[PDB]
Amino acid sequence: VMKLYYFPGACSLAPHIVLREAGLDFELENVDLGTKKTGSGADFLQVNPKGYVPALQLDDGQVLTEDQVILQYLADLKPESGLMPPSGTFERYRLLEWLAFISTEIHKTFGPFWNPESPEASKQIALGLLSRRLDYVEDRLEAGGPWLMGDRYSVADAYLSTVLGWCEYLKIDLSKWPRILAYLERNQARPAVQAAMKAEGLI
Residues within the annotated binding site for glutathione? 11, 36, 53, 67, 107-108
- Note whether 5 and 44 are within 8 A (CB): yes
127 is a site residue for a second copy (CB under 8 A): no
Angstrom distance (rounded) from CA 84 to CA 91: 9
In degrees and rounded to multiples of 5, residue 111 shows phi and psi of -50, -65
89 is a site residue for a second copy (CB under 8 A): no
Per CB under 8 A, contacts with a second copy among 48-67 are 49-50, 62, 64-67
Cβ neighbours for 170, distance < 8 A, ≥ 6 positions apart: 110, 113
35 is a site residue for a second copy (CB under 8 A): no
Nearer to a second copy, 81 or 103 (CB): 103
> Nearest-CA neighbor of 10 among 120, 147, 166, 191?
166
**Count of residues in contact with a second copy, rule CB under 8 A:** 34
Cβ neighbours for 106, distance < 8 A, ≥ 6 positions apart: 130, 133, 160, 163, 164
- Note whether 78 and 24 are within 8 A (CB): yes
78 is a site residue for a second copy (CB under 8 A): no
11 contact, one of a second copy, ligand GSH, none, CB 5-8 Å limit per kind: ligand GSH
Q: Which residues form the interface with ligand GSH (CB under 6 A)?
A: 7, 10-11, 33, 51-53, 65-67, 103-105
Nearer to ligand GSH, 81 or 103 (CB): 103
181 contact, one of ligand GSH, a second copy, none, CB 5-8 Å limit per kind: none
